[PDB]
């Protein structure tokens, strides 16, 4: 009974949400806002300390001629000003990216074959445990072989470690459980069974390098740093010469032959190395998010936690800073994770599909696309038309297009069980929206969307790709806000409805099911709220080595 965004609209405005008129211009400009008032005073402090003018509310146009609104973080009861959701002002958001950037997945399967076949030595659970004790000393930046080595301060690199997982329960039980990501503890029974079957007897490391190094350096540092201390720990634990020909096999295994990067490197116009946001494919982002293992009876919640994960990362930090910068793109992304608005539209479409077809039981074709995406699109745009407060909240057309199409595309995948028809539903939603209101998004918003229909099912070289394999470097997606996070959500959608344990890579899914991570990937929107309230404690700070 209320739409899910009604409480939020009542919090923001004095009027009832259906009223078409309000009062402007007498709110005191920036003085209506606690946050803007903190910023004005901070700008005065800064400028006076450094001798250069900085933040000044009277430069340019005067903010706050309308209500500067609070936003509800969706699924929470936390209301904050938008500035508290900017990635610069939110340590939870910065740490979410650091936890991804500083992670690499590294097999032990080739390494253990080097040991047995080339060195002619034995590998057992006990040698592996000894190896893991060694690498958890060395990985943070400490020495195992040479004399007179100088080392990292252990308290500065407390967030660096190495864990392992395996699909063989009896092997996993013989490794010291301090080092093991326990699949049967972290995952519901049917998911655990799927994931263990994918991994089989393989043994894989999850390596996290120090946040302080990741922030000093870059994403491409992670797999190198990992390989260095894997290599030292193999020398120490298995009694090689410290530097013989066989040492090189371990190096090539750890850097190249059994490595799973979070992101692949990018082409020169957006030159970046591995483990940067642009290389993370949408399927991996859906698997990093850990909503699937905790909210597995609610496929809308899983899918929209993925949307929140990807809208923040891909629009606020990646497109809004790495690829641009400045004030950036906070509310282009907050539209998809605030006020329970996407939630209202997607629960609507889930219920529609469930009642008409049954989840995953619609035919995988254009008839379903035309049905579900049209119906949900028309639902979402009607809400903006029925509630003037809603349209004033999601005031930019791009925000509305992303939200409405995300609901339509997720709902379409809910019906077919296939991402590709979900994506076709996303583009059809944009086309209907554009005709209905005679507007869609910002000047360059629908580059991908006008190419979209034709490239959904193409098989040509730089056109054809299942949605799960696409990412920020898929050519038509490489530039613009208000899409990438939503696509990660549509990739999650059909798998959530099917009850699949993972979307694209089962090692990536297990790798983030780790309670020693700093950010909590099981509740991304909860963490964003915590950071907005200045209650999140990140890794990587320099307080220990700076003056009190």
């Amino acid at each position: 009974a209320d739409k899910l965004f009604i409480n939020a609209l009542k919090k923001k405005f004095e009027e009832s949400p259906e009223e078409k008129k309000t009062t402007f211009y007498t709110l005191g400009g920036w003085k209506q806002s606690e946050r803007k008032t903190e910023f004005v005073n901070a700008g005065k402090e800064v400028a006076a300390k450094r001798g250069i003018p900085q933040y000044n509310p009277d430069i340019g146009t005067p903010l706050g001629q309308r209500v500067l609104m609070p936003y509800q973080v969706s699924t929470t009861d936390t209301y904050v000003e938008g500035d508290d959701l900017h990635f610069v002002n939110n340590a939870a958001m910065q740490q979410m990216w650091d936890d991804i950037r500083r992670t690499v997945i590294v097999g032990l399967n080739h390494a253990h074959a080097v040991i047995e076949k080339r060195l002619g030595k034995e590998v057992t659970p006990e040698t592996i445990t000894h190896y893991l004790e060694t690498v958890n000393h060395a990985m943070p930046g400490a020495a195992v072989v040479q004399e007179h080595m100088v080392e990292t301060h252990p308290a500065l690199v407390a967030d660096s470690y190495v864990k392992v997982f395996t699909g063989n329960d009896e092997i996993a039980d013989e490794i010291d459980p301090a080092f093991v990501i326990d699949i049967n503890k972290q995952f519901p029974e049917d998911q655990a069974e799927t994931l263990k079957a994918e991994v089989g007897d393989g043994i894989w490391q999850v390596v996290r390098i120090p946040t302080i190094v990741s922030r000093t350096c870059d994403g491409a540092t992670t797999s190198r740093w990992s390989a260095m201390q894997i290599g030292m720990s193999m020398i120490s634990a298995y009694k090689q010469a410290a530097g013989e020909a066989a040492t090189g096999d371990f190096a090539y295994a750890a850097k190249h032959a059994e490595v799973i990067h979070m992101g692949t490197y990018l082409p020169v116009r957006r030159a970046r190395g591995e483990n940067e946001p642009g290389g993370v494919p949408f399927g991996y982002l859906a698997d990093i998010c850990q909503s699937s293992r905790v909210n597995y009876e609610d496929p809308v919640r899983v899918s929209l936690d993925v949307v929140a994960t990807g809208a923040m990362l891909y629009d606020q930090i990646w497109l809004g800073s790495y690829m641009s910068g400045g004030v950036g793109f906070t509310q282009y992304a907050t539209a998809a994770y605030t006020d329970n608005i996407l939630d209202d539209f997607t629960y609507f479409g889930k219920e529609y599909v469930e009642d008409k077809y049954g989840l995953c039981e619609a035919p995988n074709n254009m008839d379903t696309v035309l049905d579900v995406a049209t119906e949900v699109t028309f639902y979402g745009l009607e809400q903006y038309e029925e509630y003037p407060a809603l349209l004033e909240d999601q005031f930019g057309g791009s925000q509305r297009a992303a939200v409405v199409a995300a609901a339509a595309g997720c709902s379409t995948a809910f019906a077919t069980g296939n991402a590709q028809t979900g994506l076709s539903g996303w583009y059809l939603s944009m086309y209907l929206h554009k005709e209905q209101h005679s507007r869609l998004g910002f000047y360059g918003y629908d580059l991908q969307d006008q190419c979209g229909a034709s490239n959904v099912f193409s098989i040509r070289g730089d056109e054809g790709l299942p949605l799960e394999l696409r990412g920020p470097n898929y050519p038509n997606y490489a530039m613009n806000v208000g899409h990438q996070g939503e696509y990660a959500g549509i990739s999650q959608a059909p798998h959530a409805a099917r009850g699949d344990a993972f979307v694209f890579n089962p090692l990536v899914k297990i790798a983030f099911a780790d309670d020693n991570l700093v950010f909590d990937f099981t509740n991304v929107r909860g963490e964003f709220a915590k950071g907005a309230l200045r209650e999140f404690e990140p890794a990587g700070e320099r307080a220990l080595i700076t003056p009190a």
């Binding site: 229909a453 070289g461 530039m479």
Partner: protein
């Protein structure tokens, strides 16, 4: 013989050259003049001898505002250009009778170099052109003045810049139409990473020739990319024909009919009527006071629509004599034609999409720039497979001076050298003649 289509071919004055040419006589895979254009672009280099001399004399080498105090070398390069160029030619050529060309321009200030075809026959790609040319001129300059072992590295820095510390030839005094292989957005893209300004510069702002060079380069890249293989081949060949080669005089005749007073909208109405007149489309269904058109040949509808698109650019941007609106024309030509007919726009929406981002990235703060710096390899304009960029080239050709980053600013060295090559400058002439010449081999 793979396809049955035939086209009539015209010159850039609208006069018929050759009737009934099989469509495959214009394929990049078959037409010898397209082969010669591509092999030419691969092997031609422009050398700025004046720039080299000024870089050495001031010790300004290795990129913007760079200088090495105390490294100055005063060499009379331009004064001895004949000798240097002849010495360089000796190293560049494989044999004395081959197709090596070295020609001095501007009283010795510049040189056109075409590296011999034999070097590309045993090469993976095209970088032998700049690298063989650069080393031949470095060595010829050192040999000319007996520059010492201790100082010769300054001659290298004046010719090829900061390379290999930079990935590019940063601060180089040589230039090519192609760019380095590392900057390809994907495999198969090299013939797309040619600035629109360079295309307009080489063709001296002749609108139809610029459109022709751009379309030849774009659609040839579509074969290297594999996009024009199998099911899509005919669509790409009909696009080259109707959009870039003024096939059947369709572009030319739409411009003639709309040039004095027309708008994008009027070109559209003429094109739909012509497609109707020719049997390309027909009424499939009647709604309320609205006819829905259908087609049994999507590839031919696409080509006709593509020809309309080129003509609407020439009319809209030509009327302004200002290129910036090409982004708008690429968008609303296609938007309008879809609601006019019930059929998909050019390249099934991909032109329209390209035009959306191109508009953004040419009227905002976040990137791109004016129309002339874009190209088929640019992230903003790679998306349409050959049907958008040739319109940009035509719009920049028609610009009368509204741009800060004009061909004069970005492409002056390319213009002086590459416009000398007849096939680069007037490709529409050579390609039509070749297609006529091989017309019975198809």
């Amino acid at each position: 013989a793979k396809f049955e289509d035939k086209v009539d071919l015209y010159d850039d004055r609208g006069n018929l050259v050759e009737e009934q040419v099989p469509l495959e006589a214009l394929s990049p895979l078959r037409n010898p003049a397209i082969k010669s254009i591509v092999q030419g672009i691969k092997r031609t280099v422009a050398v700025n001898l004046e720039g080299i001399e000024n870089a050495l004399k001031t010790a300004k080498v290795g990129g913007p505002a760079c200088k090495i105090m105390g490294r100055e070398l005063d060499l009379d390069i331009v004064g001895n250009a004949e000798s240097i160029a002849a010495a360089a030619k000796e190293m560049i050529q494989v044999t004395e009778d081959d197709d090596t060309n070295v020609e001095l321009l501007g009283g010795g200030k510049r040189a056109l170099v075409q590296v011999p075809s034999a070097r590309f026959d045993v090469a993976a790609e095209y970088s032998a052109a700049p690298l063989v040319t650069a080393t031949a001129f470095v060595q010829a300059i050192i040999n000319e003045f007996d520059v010492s072992m201790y100082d010769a590295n300054m001659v290298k820095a004046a010719v090829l810049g900061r390379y290999p510390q930079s990935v590019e030839y940063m601060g180089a005094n040589i230039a090519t139409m192609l760019d380095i292989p590392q900057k390809l957005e994907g495999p198969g893209y090299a013939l797309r990473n040619i600035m629109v300004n360079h295309v307009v510069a080489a063709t001296l702002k002749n609108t139809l020739q610029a459109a022709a060079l751009s379309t030849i380069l774009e659609q040839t890249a579509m074969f290297e990319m594999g996009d024009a293989v199998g099911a899509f081949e005919r669509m790409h060949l009909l696009g080259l024909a109707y959009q870039g080669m003024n096939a059947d005089n369709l572009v030319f005749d739409l411009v003639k009919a709309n040039g004095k007073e027309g708008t994008v909208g009027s070109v559209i109405a003429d094109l739909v009527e012509r497609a109707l007149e020719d049997g390309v489309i027909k009424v499939e269904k009647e709604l309320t006071d609205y006819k829905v058109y259908g087609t049994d040949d999507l590839a031919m509808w696409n080509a006709y629509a593509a020809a309309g698109l080129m003509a609407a650019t020439m009319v809209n941007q030509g009327a302004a004599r200002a290129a910036q609106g090409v982004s708008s024309t690429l968008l609303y030509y296609n938007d309008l034609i879809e609601f006019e007919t019930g059929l998909p726009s050019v390249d099934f929406g991909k032109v329209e999409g390209t035009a959306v981002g191109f508009s953004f990235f040419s009227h905002s703060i976040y990137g791109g720039g004016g129309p002339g710096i874009f190209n088929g390899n640019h992230i903003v304009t790679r998306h349409s497979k050959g049907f958008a960029i040739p319109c940009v080239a035509a719009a920049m050709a028609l610009d009368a001076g509204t741009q800060m980053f004009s061909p004069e600013a970005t492409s002056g060295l390319i213009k002086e050298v590459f416009s000398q090559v007849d096939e680069f400058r007037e490709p529409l002439k050579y390609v039509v003649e070749a297609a006529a010449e091989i017309k019975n081999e198809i």
